[model samples]
Target: LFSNQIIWFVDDTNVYRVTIHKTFEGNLTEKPINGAIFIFNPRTGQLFLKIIHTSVWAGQKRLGQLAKWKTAEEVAALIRSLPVEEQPKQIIVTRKGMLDPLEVHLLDFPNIVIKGSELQLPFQACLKVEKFGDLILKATEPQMVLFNLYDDWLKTISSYTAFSRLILILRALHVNNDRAKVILKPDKTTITEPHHIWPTLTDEEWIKVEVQLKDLILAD
Candidate 1:
């Protein structure tokens, strides 16, 4: 059985989707895999879960079994189980590398400290600070602007990646893209050149991207 849990969050649509892949010994192959797809629709406040089974010789034909249907309250409780973000502090401290000697400060925090050791400031203090160092750094206004652009580009790339993989999986299952779209949304936009261009995505966002891809592959 695949241990990794595939998950994705749709910001614009406020939707959450996850998939878990499992396999068992069968005649078709050494291991026949089945997938469980879970989706939470915020608009309707409903949670849907479906299981699909696929194999090599079977090509594209598959079976889906309804697993569970949850209401808003249950869904809320389920989603709440996820970890929450830490509260933002008044001031945030970051490290500077040898290449950049100048220390940058955000509008929220006017005082900037450039030092080798990490400083542990009191969270409740008027001046709250946290240390970040080495090659890794936090984003300021300018950096954030560029970061947003990069994420946008990444979003497009991620969409294409998922779409292509979905196509292949669908073909393997003997299903057409058009029919698959009935259950899965497909993004089809012309690729365009970006004027400019890691740490661009947070760990959570990266996990989401990876899980989204896995979800598609497993579902297919």
Candidate 2:
């Protein structure tokens, strides 16, 4: 049943996917072999083997197969015939199992730290302001103070400062594309109005973020 079964192996830092053809019977002498191995499958009545190398399939023309039986020493001699630098030094096969299905599409924000009324973001990472609204609404009381602070800041702030702060807030809320309309709108006006900003998270994404916010609150 191993025929055409794809298996993954690692050598040093490189990962390789190998296709095992037919039912071959053999065992590695060691857990991790620096070279390769060969075995005869009585079911198929053919010799099958695998060669390890840094390159894909070691640049070999075919999957290691032989019509007639040959000793391990003979295989070793054949491998030695290649350039010394081309030899593989290590191969460790990973355990096999059925692959899991991928997760649904979702935005991933960096680790968030809520300190009293403020939110701290790590360097080189920024959360969308639109999604931030979801977090605030879910957190309610504690985060409302932040929302008010943002509101007050927008009122007195310059266009540049207003633009930057609104950028973070709107992005956290998932609003995008109509930057000019939102930025030019009255600073005191509510930013979440669907009329002013159209693009936001889908229903599924909103529910997912709500659950994530719940977990974050519980963890905190």
Candidate 3:
């Protein structure tokens, strides 16, 4: 059985591992529609979705109104609903032509990080789509089962990652601190073992790692 879908390794004392996901879900809307936001964690495979509507405080008349083209405020609303710890570092906009106007609304949160970019669906995320094809055909409420499957996947990952929740315990493992683009490679092989997932260090590199780690531990 496939044990690991992802793995992290360190060359020095730094984790060099990153866990990121895209939320703020909705498709391109020419006009307006009832909007929804979905926060997903691919590692633990958990998701939360909510539909946006006019706030009751706004007015009784507006209560039934669906937030059509209004995205930025809705984006803000979702962030506010979450506890401080759950807020994302940055929100990557997935919809086309909504970023610029959204920025105007984003200013509402001066400290929060917001950026506009198209999200590229990961291969693993896409793979689960096929699982839906068969399930949806038989189920009336497919969305209900979708999140359930995501949660069940956490069991498989929990053994090694020890991720009780979505938050990555990066500092606990003592990975170095630096932000840089990881050289992405295709997941072409079926090898799931830790050694097979990453390249082995040469003797020279291994010693360098040992020395660097010793320095890192001593500094601590």
Candidate 4:
């Protein structure tokens, strides 16, 4: 652990808010957690945005154009591209849904503060109204594929602004943490259906269950 240093904490998540930025007019979508992180040092009123436009070459074609595919070690390359200073002493991340599927690949990192989050990041607003908004497409790929990135017309956002609305991500984490704490519960059984067989408890039942389980896992 780099705790001996400034003890910087990096909050990187795939909850759309971290990657896709949305606003009233248009939105900006970047690879999940592959963009710049708004780092604010209270000690120094300086705010820095570190970005790593991954080498993942991505380009898709419309009806009359051709479609090309790109590949790279997304997680590995990202970890390598980030400078030592950029790597926070403590990495704050969440585990659930598609997030785990990707983060599990990074567990080998030196330090990662694995937590849970409840509030759903407001990413739907940035769901670029592409050619087919409500359309669902079929998918068939090589089995047991651990890492890969492909661009499909279905996901291609024909309309969007570069880095537009990216500023909102600054307070999104703060707002979500507050919301989670307010709605956090004592028992996970309430939301986790599979655990229904277990007895329920009051708010104080699992007060000390885990450091921030209440605020992280049970809030939403």
Best-matching candidate per TM-score: 3
Quote model 2's TM-score. 0.14
Off by over 4 Å in 2: 1-199
lDDT of 4: 0.29
lDDT of 2 at 152: 34
| Models ranked on TM-score | 3, 4, 1, 2
Whose TM-score is higher: candidate 2's or candidate 4's? 4
Over all chains combined, what TM-score does candidate 3 have? 0.36
Please, what are the lDDT tens digits per residue for candidate 3 over residues 3-29?
333211101100011124444684442
Q: After superposing candidate 3, which stretches have Cα over 4 Å from the reference?
A: 1-35, 52-69, 122-149, 158-220
Candidate 2 lDDT over 137-159, as tens digits, reads 24312111112223333334443
Each prediction's Cα lDDT score? Answer: 0.26, 0.27, 0.34, 0.29
lDDT of 4 at 14: 17
Q: Which candidate number maximizes lDDT?
A: 3
Error of 3 at 133 (Å): 13
State which candidate, 2 or 4, has the greater lDDT.
4
lDDT of 4 by residue, 60-129 (tens): 2231111010111243344566686654444322224324533555566656443344533332221221
For model 2, how big is the CA root-mean-square deviation? 26.0
